[PDB]
Design an enzyme around this catalytic site. Structure first.
Site, PDB file in Angstrom:
ATOM      1  N   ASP A 193       0.792  -1.023   0.005  1.00 64.52           N
ATOM      2  CA  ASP A 193       0.083   0.045   0.165  1.00 64.52           C
ATOM      3  C   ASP A 193       0.828   1.231   0.066  1.00 64.52           C
ATOM      4  OD1 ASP A 193      -2.435   1.025  -0.192  1.00 64.52           O
ATOM      5  OD2 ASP A 193      -2.761   1.300   1.886  1.00 64.52           O
TER       6      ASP A 193
ATOM      7  N   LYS B 189       1.443   4.597  -0.942  1.00 64.14           N
ATOM      8  CA  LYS B 189       0.961   5.861  -1.528  1.00 64.14           C
ATOM      9  C   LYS B 189       1.037   7.108  -0.709  1.00 64.14           C
ATOM     10  CE  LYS B 189      -3.374   4.710   0.451  1.00 64.14           C
ATOM     11  NZ  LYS B 189      -4.599   5.233   0.468  1.00 64.14           N
TER      12      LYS B 189
ATOM     13  N   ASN C  25      -0.439   7.699   2.706  1.00 64.76           N
ATOM     14  CA  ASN C  25       0.058   6.911   3.655  1.00 64.76           C
ATOM     15  C   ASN C  25       1.179   7.231   4.624  1.00 64.76           C
ATOM     16  OD1 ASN C  25      -1.891   4.684   3.874  1.00 64.76           O
ATOM     17  ND2 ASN C  25      -0.836   3.340   2.533  1.00 64.76           N
TER      18      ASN C  25
ATOM     19  N   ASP D  23      -0.080   2.975   7.571  1.00 66.50           N
ATOM     20  CA  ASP D  23      -0.795   1.934   8.060  1.00 66.50           C
ATOM     21  C   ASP D  23      -0.583   0.581   7.300  1.00 66.50           C
ATOM     22  OD1 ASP D  23      -2.924   0.655   6.393  1.00 66.50           O
ATOM     23  OD2 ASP D  23      -3.652   2.887   6.317  1.00 66.50           O
TER      24      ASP D  23
ATOM     25  N   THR E 155      -4.447   1.073  -4.438  1.00 63.37           N
ATOM     26  CA  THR E 155      -4.869   2.194  -4.970  1.00 63.37           C
ATOM     27  C   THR E 155      -4.027   2.199  -6.419  1.00 63.37           C
ATOM     28  OG1 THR E 155      -5.446   3.816  -3.265  1.00 63.37           O
ATOM     29  CG2 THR E 155      -4.367   4.635  -5.010  1.00 63.37           C
TER      30      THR E 155
END
Ligand SMILES: Nc1ncnc2c1ncn2[C@@H]1O[C@H](COP(=O)(O)OP(=O)(O)O)[C@@H](O)[C@H]1O
Ligand SMILES: [Mg+2]
Length: 341
Positions: free
Chosen positions: A157, A159, A162, A175, A192
Site C-alpha cells: 500500500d 502511496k 500513507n 498503516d 490504490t
C-alpha cells in the site's frame, strides 16, 4: 567487508522480529493511564485522539476503533494482521506501536505521534519536489522495504497519503492493513489504482517485486507532480499501466529517467529490485550515488523540509471544542474474535 554489516543487522533484525512474531505482546496498558486531548485524525474505525502518558509525560497518537464496526465492515482479519505486524516490526521509518490493548467496547492502538502530516497534502502545497529533495524521501522508502521484504513482508500500500513527515522532517510509515507476510506469492487485489503493479492488474500471481513498481510510481509522481498513470476512470488507468509506455517530463534527469524505466518495468523478470543483485541494483544506481545510506538510517542528514513545529503542545487543541470522551460497555462485545489482540 563493512557492507557485510548490513547482512548481520538484518539477521539480528529478523532473528528478533520472529521472536515478537511468534509470541506477540498484548495489553501493555490500561486506558486509565493517560488523558485524551484532541482528535488528531478521522481514521478507519474511530476518532484518533491525542494522548499524554502520565508516567513518562510523553505524547502519543492513539487509534481507537470499535469492535463491532470492524466485523460489520468484515475486516476482523485485516486489523488483527495489522497489529501483529506493527507489534513485531521495528525500523527508524516505521510508526512504532508503543502500546496495544482491548477492553469491551473497542481495541486501542497507541502509536508514536508525529508532528507535520501526510505528504500527499504536503505535495499539494509545493507543486513538485526537486530531484535531490525527492531523493531524500525515496532513499528512506528503499531502506524501509529492504527491511520489510527481508522479513518476507510486502507493504502493498505505498502511496503518499500513507507516509507521513517526521517532527524532524523524515518519513514515518502509515498503516499496514494490506501488508502481508508472504514467503511465496499472492493474489489479493488490494491497493490504490495508480500504484498497482501490472502483475496485480492482470490477476497473475504477484510477489514482493510489486513494492518496487510502487516505489517507481512514487518516485515519478514526486519529481514530476502528476503520477505516471492517471485517468478519469480506473479501467482507463489499468490499460495505461499494462501497456507500460511511460512519458517523462522535460526537466527529468538522464539518471532519474533511467531508474524509473527500470523500476517501472512491465516484465517482472527485468524489474529492478527483484533481480540477482536484489536491492543493491537500486542502492548502487547512479541516481543514488550522492546518498549515504547509513547516514539516512541514523537520520544524520539535513532534511529538505522541516514542518514548523510549535512543539507537541497544540496551538489549536482539538481544533476548538469536540465530542467529549468515550464509553466502554458493561457487557463484552465480540471477545471471541479478538482473543489474539
Ligand atoms: N502517529 C500518527 N500521528 C499523526 N497522525 C496519525 C498517526 N497515525 C495515524 N494518523 C492519522 O490517521 C489517519 C488514518 O490512519 P492510517 O495511517 O491511514 O491508518 P488507517 O487507514 O488504518 O486508519 C491518517 O490520515 C493519519 O493522518
Ligand atoms: Mg491509511
Amino acid at each position: 567487508s563493512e557492507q557485510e554489516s548490513v547482512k548481520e543487522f538484518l539477521a539480528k533484525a529478523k532473528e528478533d522480529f520472529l521472536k515478537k512474531w511468534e509470541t506477540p505482546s498484548q495489553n501493555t496498558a490500561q486506558l486509565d493511564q493517560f488523558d485524551r486531548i484532541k482528535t488528531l485524525g478521522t481514521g478507519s474505525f474511530g476518532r484518533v485522539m491525542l494522548v499524554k502518558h502520565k508516567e513518562s509525560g510523553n505524547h502519543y497518537a492513539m487509534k481507537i476503533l470499535d469492535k463491532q464496526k470492524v466485523v460489520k465492515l468484515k475486516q476482523i482479519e485485516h486489523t488483527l494482521n495489522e497489529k501483529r505486524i506493527l507489534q513485531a516490526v521495528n525500523f527508524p521509518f516505521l510508526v512504532k506501536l508503543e502500546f496495544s490493548f482491548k477492553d469491551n467496547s473497542n481495541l486501542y492502538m497507541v502509536m508514536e505521534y508525529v508532528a507535520g502530516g501526510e505528504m500527499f497534502s504536503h505535495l499539494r502545497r509545493i507543486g513538485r519536489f526537486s530531484e535531490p529533495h525527492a531523493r531524500f524521501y525515496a532513499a528512506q522508502i528503499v531502506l524501509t522495504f529492504e527491511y520489510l521484504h527481508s522479513l518476507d513482508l510486502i507493504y502493498r500500500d505505498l502511496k503518499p497519503e500513507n507516509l507521513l513527515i517526521d517532527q524532524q522532517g523524515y518519513i514515518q510509515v502509515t498503516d499496514f492493513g494490506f501488508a502481508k507476510r508472504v514467503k511465496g506469492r499472492t493474489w489479493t487485489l488490494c491497493g490504490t489504482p495508480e500504484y498497482l503493479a501490472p502483475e496485480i492488474i492482470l490477476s497473475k500471481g504477484y510477489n514482493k517485486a510489486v513494492d518496487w513498481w510502487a516505489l517507481g510510481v512514487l518516485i515519478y509522481e514526486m519529481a514530476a507532480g502528476y503520477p505516471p498513470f492517471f485517468a478519469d476512470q480506473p479501467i482507463q488507468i489499468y490499460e495505461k499501466i499494462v501497456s507500460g509506455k511511460v512519458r517523462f517530463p522535460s526537466h527529468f534527469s538522464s539518471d532519474l529517467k533511467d531508474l524509473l524505466r527500470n523500476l517501472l518495468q512491465v516484465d517482472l523478470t527485468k524489474r529492478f529490485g527483484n533481480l540477482k543483485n536484489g536491492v543493491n541494483d537500486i542502492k548502487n544506481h547512479k541516481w543514488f550515488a550522492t546518498t549515504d545510506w547509513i547516514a539516512i538510517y541514523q537520520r544524520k542528514v539535513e532534511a529538505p523540509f522541516i514542518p514548523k513545529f510549535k512543539g507537541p503542545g497544540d496551538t489549536s487543541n482539538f481544533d476548538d471544542y469536540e465530542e467529549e470522551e468515550i464509553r466502554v460497555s458493561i457487557n463484552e462485545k465480540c471477545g471471541k474474535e479478538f482473543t489474539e489482540f
